[PDB]
């Protein structure tokens with residue numbers, strides 16, 4: 001129905017600035033290839049696991065112990081990502097509250113936040129829109145670096161509090177009963193994107209942007225950054241690896257098809273990404289023509305690209321207040337939907353392990369939301385964009401790829417792809433097929449391992465638009481990244497130590513399904529013969 005139209009904030013906010021940073025059309029090849037190779041198979045696998053096991057993300061490993069750390073890693077990654085996603089909803093709320101006027105604040109250089117170097121056009125950042133973004137919302141000119149953070153800005157704290165309160169009151173009494181937060185997330189993004197796409201092709205100088213978008217230069221390939229970014233964006237926008245798909249599938253009809261769900265979700269994700277890229281590059285070409293500069297020196301390459309691009313296109317339409325209000329309401333709805341999904345995933349995954357948290361939902365929800373608010377207090381300071389840049393690089397970078405790789409390895413090699421394909425035939429009626437099984441078993445681990453190894457080997461020091469972080473910010477970032485990657489060996493060691501027996505009865509009590517326990521004494525254990533390990 002309308003619950004398959006999964007359009008996320010990572011498709012409207014994050015894809016545009018990753019596509020512009022990596023050249024343009026030289027970014028869609030590693031994206032589409034990675035989609036085909038590993039996004040659909042893993043989305044299918046996650047949907048099938050969640051549907052069949054009828055449980056959350058951390059207690060879903062009742063089919064194979066020694067692997068519960070994969071759930072605790074994706075529970076922590078979800079937390080880290082919500083400490084910075086709620087600051088992009090606060091920005092949207094600030095812009096929406098500033099949009100209620102007949103003279104938009106991002107059109108003139110005669111305000112109190114304008115530097116005397118403001119040039120009206122009639123990396124830069126001396127334009128009215130960039131000046132507004134960097135000096136009236138962020139107040140970044142009062143910070144010198146990550147070492148000089150400053151105090152939180154009250155005008156953004158008052159917007160963060162509203163977001164936190166809304167999230168808590170939407171999550172405090174069970175899950176939302178559906179069809180309340182998505183009947184507008186489904187329709188509005190497509191209408192707004194269509195209007196922007198049809199309007200932006202008639203602007204002067206948009207042809208250059210379109211040509212730059214539909215042009216592939218191969219020198220940008222053969223470099224690690226494009227492939228790493230494409231893989232991370234796939235496993236950020238498809239929803240896999242965050243533990244949300246399993247929790248969502250845990251509440252569903254048993255015989256609901258997931259083949260069609262996976263195909264439709266992937267196709268719509270690709271279409272929306274392509275349309276967003278087209279619109280963004282058309283606006284970029286327009287601005288490049290207006291300022292008489294190249295298309296590569298006209299806009300920032302950071303996380304605030306849309307908040308400088310989209311207002312510029314809005315200010316050219318007829319009735320630029322109605323459209324601004326519509327666009328920012330759409331952004332707010334998308335952000336609220338994504339935050340609700342992530343927080344629900346966390347709460348369910350933590351309340352399935354322990355039974356004392358299932359009768360204290362108010363207190364637990366309050367705890368999670370208040371922790372998120374307190375930890376997000378760091379990103380609304382006068383130098384919070386640096387912290388947001390650190391967290392948007394190291395919270396789900398190599399760690400998410402490692403988690404997905406470990407989950408795929410675990411399932412396909414230790415539980416058995418034969419059993420995985422035999423319990424899907426038991427609940428749908430058809431056996432997956434050769435392509436899906438081969439894809440999972442051999443093609444997903446290989447490419448995921450290649451990406452992880454290349455990312456570790458070819459690391460690049462962190463920078464923000466000519467600003468170079470001190471050499472300890474990278475250490476802090478790697479410490480954040482390894483905080484979830486280390487939970488997998490630790491749980492294996494603890495589980496191995498906590499049981500009793502020899503090497504046998506310990507290596508085998510944590511590799512067989514929990515239900516299949518009274519066959520260890522009989523020694524009827526499949527994983528030890530070679531014919532388990534030659535699955536097709």
Ligand SMILES: C[C@@H](NC(C)(C)C)C(=O)c1cccc(Cl)c1
Nearest residue numbers: 078082085239242244339341342
């Ligand atoms: C992966 C995706 N989650 C959905 C619900 C599947 C879209 C997401 O972008 C996210 C993940 C964790 C936390 C937050 Cl706030 C957002």
